[PDB]
Amino acid sequence: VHPYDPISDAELQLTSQLIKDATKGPERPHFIQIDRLDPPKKDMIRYLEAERTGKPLPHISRMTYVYYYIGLDFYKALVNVSYGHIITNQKQPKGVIGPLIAEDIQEIEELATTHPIVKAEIEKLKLPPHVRVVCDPWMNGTDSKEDRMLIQCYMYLASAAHPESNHYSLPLKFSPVFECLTKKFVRMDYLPGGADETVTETQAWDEFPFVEYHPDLNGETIVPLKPLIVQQPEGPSFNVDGHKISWQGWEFFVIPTVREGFAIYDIHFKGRSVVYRLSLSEMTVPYGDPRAPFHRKQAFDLGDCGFGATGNSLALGCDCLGVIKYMDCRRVNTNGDSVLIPNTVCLHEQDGGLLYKHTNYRTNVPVIARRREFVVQTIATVANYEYMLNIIFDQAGEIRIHVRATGILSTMPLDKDVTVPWGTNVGPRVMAAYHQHMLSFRIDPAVDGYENTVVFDDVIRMEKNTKLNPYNVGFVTERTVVEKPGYVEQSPFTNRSYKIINENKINPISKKPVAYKIMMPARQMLLADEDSYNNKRAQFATQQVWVTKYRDNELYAAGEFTNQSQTDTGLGVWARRDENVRNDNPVVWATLGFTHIPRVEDFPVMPVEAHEIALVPFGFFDKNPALSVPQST
Amino acid sequence: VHPYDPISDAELQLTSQLIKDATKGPERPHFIQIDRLDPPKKDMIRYLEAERTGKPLPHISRMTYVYYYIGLDFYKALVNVSYGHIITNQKQPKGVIGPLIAEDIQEIEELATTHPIVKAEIEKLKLPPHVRVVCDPWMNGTDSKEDRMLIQCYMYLASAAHPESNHYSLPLKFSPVFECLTKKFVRMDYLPGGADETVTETQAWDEFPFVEYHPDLNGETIVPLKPLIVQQPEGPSFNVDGHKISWQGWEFFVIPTVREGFAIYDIHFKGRSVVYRLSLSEMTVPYGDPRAPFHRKQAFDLGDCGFGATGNSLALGCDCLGVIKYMDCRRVNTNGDSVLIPNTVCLHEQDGGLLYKHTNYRTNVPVIARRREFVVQTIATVANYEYMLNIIFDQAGEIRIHVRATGILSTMPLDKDVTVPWGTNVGPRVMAAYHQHMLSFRIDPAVDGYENTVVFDDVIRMEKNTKLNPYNVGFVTERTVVEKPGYVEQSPFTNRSYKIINENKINPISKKPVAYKIMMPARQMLLADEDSYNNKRAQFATQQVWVTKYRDNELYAAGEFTNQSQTDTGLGVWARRDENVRNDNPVVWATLGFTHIPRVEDFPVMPVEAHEIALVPFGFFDKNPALSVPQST
């Protein structure tokens, strides 16, 4: 029972039992989230040390956290499940609101088509019997001080005849708002369908131009394909022992977590340390339609919902090609039970093309190796969206963070003959507003050991017309050291390169500190004005790379409670501490910015758009580490 | 013979034979390059139309060009090979120098180690029995007005033991220069191995620290791997008819060419036109070591040598995984004969991960398709480098240009205890100078037809604090039209997106012209100072996107004759024509900039570094075109 292990049924239920026992009276605890805390890092580095060198393993208590409500009051407790005691069980200040949970959303979704005010609104549409109404409950977002947990219910039409009909293809022009925990009606909002902010009372609905994606409904003739099969007749080249993966020189743990999907720990390659913990830390999805209620669409999908909570089961359709191993996730329900989320993480090899090749032109004798890869993947369904998260390792020591966005666009109503400059029309009566997906990747590096420095290098021209450079072609690198928490500015035109180095371990060939470098393209950051709540709640989304000093339980880039937050309680605080991070424990938070101008081809379901960040050794080894890979032949 | 067909042996030899017959006297023609010209585009479009609709085919002659020398005089001729006559046969002006040819390089390489004057330098090294001298002859480059074709011979040491010993791991400090066609020794250059530009006479060589890549020599323990196999039990899903490929809705011609490796023509997807001609057009590799003779290392690998001339045989191999079809290239030798280069192009299908997924959270019914990809590939070996060029097509209408650079670094001598700020040390006595690979891709677009406009869209904030945008979150696109030949500036911070649109064909859903968009990251451009020959010779490498008006035989970014060129005779002239290119025949030249700071891991042979540009349908279709793809199931 390893300290990194994901939460068990017994730990999750013990945690809720203890809260139930501690809560007196008739309003019972309403559970929101429960998961296992990481072991304290200083302690766990000693545990792993002992585990690698066969010495006796130190005690590390298993700890969990719980978010729960008692009536309208929100609570966060810390529980020691090794010894069965609550350590802290604290009511949170006014305005701190927990994540959404499936059971509460289901309740509100039911209500949004059942409530008499909403039935009466629906009646004004004068729907024929072949058309039904569907609701997507959304988190409220923030445009004001608001301490109540509110649900903004987006309303749509679907075909009554088929349960997979594409409601996103026909948005309505009203949206009711409920208070989540009491189930009380709050107000009915009206949505503009025209070129500006004008709304009207609910009119009879004239036409039903659905744009269906499902094969039974889309009327598209299927163009056949011949099979392409992948086999591993002798089995896979990776081992899983508990949660410990071994493959081609790599050793690391892969742990499912309810908030991140999975996290990867204690990453070593060829026996050397590389990265202590790697995860998707947050993702904010701000929309750019300036009009109400749309301006409030800024989910924080990890913080408001959780990538593990929302993970698909990968085993029964075949998302992963080859010989696959799987892991499960668990979540609490509102009752405090452990709900299994089966097969959310898949692990498998695949072929990544060529790894290297060279032929001597004099002899035509080649050396060549294929780029075998090991993939860790999870896919989250977040209402309309699909996000596929992959971490891919290869035999040259590279770690590749690879995301594909797919699923369905979040859609707005559109009246006849209207266009808008902040959205693309994607169906005869449906518009998809422009948005961004701003992801933060948390990389706690341990490059060749636990004292690291973050740096960035620029590539710059040499002074022209000198004795040294008389032909005006020379160019050189210069390095800047990150001394304190903060961000680094992007600079694509000096080929700026972020690296984490170990100043204490010198490469004996290049004579510079060993390093890993980050590979990522320059990207547009937060488009919302600085004077906006979107800016205040998500500082990470405003710069490409952030550095903090490590702290236990500082994991989520916009802070622990994002749902309807008023301000950033993650990097917006942490990256401002005035402390030393040189030759220490800097933690890197890389922002992957994706501005999404939807196109028609993204509808009714969208082809994958891929985004990637790579961590690659840079003077970490004393020669290409892939000389150990068999020849391709 | 279809007009797009690659040259045949008969046509190549008819070309050289006509020139031999026309050349009188005892100085015989010395052949440098022969290939078949594209059919003139106007006629070819009519021809394709007739071929399509069963009308009589217009008459279009097969034509070739030939570069050759008579003594020291350089000539270019055009030949009609359908009827067998010379059209033009023209002595080129003083200073125009042809590409290198393998037979002439072999000759100068032999001479670099046998000429008495270089034998004398070698003797000064006092080499022991177990070491041998190796030469890589290089094109001269340009740092002065120079009319003679010169070869700079880079000199190295290798183990005498083994023909695959890595001579790049031990560079010498002298370099002989020879006049290519006369074989006259011109001069002996000396190379600095220290921190600055100081050089000495040739000294005895003290030690032999080779860094070996070959498995016989590298001493590496091989880490085993289990098999991973790809099968297509019913055969592939693509058909090849002549040079015409059909796969999953696409139809286009793949033609091998001596200069570009291959070119792809007449690209249609779902019956609609996309791109008329797609090709890697040039690649310049400028080095950033300011010192002589290094400052002159600036290859134009297509213009100076040719990607087809230099292509690997891929069937050997097997570089391409699965069920493969191959095509050949041919090149002339100095005698005018046709030399076959078997299997330089491989064509095959592969799995590219998931193409789309969506699960309705209510029912948990998924739609999912896998991303089947069709790959066209060639791999050229240019002296030390390998360049893997792929064009990948997918079922959603995307064309991905994907390049991988691998092979061996070009290396410079390095004395003990030296470092340099313009190069990385990659072995005990060998340094890899900084350099750039600047690629230009020529995309002659035919988006839904032959009248196109080039445009770029920017994503910008709405004005804050208005009635329309009261919460400061809104953002919109604005469009700029390219009206005249020239370049577009990069703007990654406004998410700038280059597109080619057809202003005559409006998407009936979005109400905007149909388009293809270019995906590519912002990159650093040419690092050589504006005041350098690198700059005057390669204007394309200074800006990321160029637009010209189409002309027949205007194919190569830096001009037809690059070797020891004084100036750019490509885009540096053509993108400065004052003419209109809106709703006409714009041609797009996309510069893929890769600044290469070598790492120790790139030596003795480098892991692939991948770079891409994608062409993606934007409002081209009225919905996702991949709804015709079968469920993955």
Ligand SMILES: [Cu+2]
């Ligand atoms: Cu999106």
Ligand SMILES: [Cu+2]
């Ligand atoms: Cu390079």
